Amino acid sequence: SMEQVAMELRLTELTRLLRSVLDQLQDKDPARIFAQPVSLKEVPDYLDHIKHPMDFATMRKRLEAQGYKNLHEFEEDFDLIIDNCMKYNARDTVFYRAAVRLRDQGGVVLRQARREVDSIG
């Protein structure tokens, strides 16, 4: 149907805007602490602590399959990156501190992304 195409075009344009959002958030992580999944070879107990692991590479895979239907879904995954780190690592660690700084800086980006998603529809 033409309606299905129009919906698919909207999904594609959302995907475009989320790709740019993702790039901007990932620039706020210059240490690349959140770039890849936590290695279960290197942290074998991780899944005992963290039930839903997340990282920027895994988000990027979902994004490129157009697997985010709305900005809420994408933000859920970004928040998991931050929140998982802040639970697993202590306050005095470079990892925890990186997560705080990512959250703080990413807030700004996400605030305008929400306006753009609503604005363009």
CB atoms within 10 A of CB 79: 14
Alpha-carbon distance 57 to 63, whole Å?
10
Resolution (A): 1.7
The CATH code that applies to domain 1-121 is 1.20.920.10
Residue 78 and residue 113 in contact, taking contact as beta carbons nearer than 8 Å? no
Q: Element (H or E) spanning 46, and its range?
A: helix 46-49
Report the C-alpha dihedral over residues 28, 31, 36, 39, rounded to 10 degrees: -140
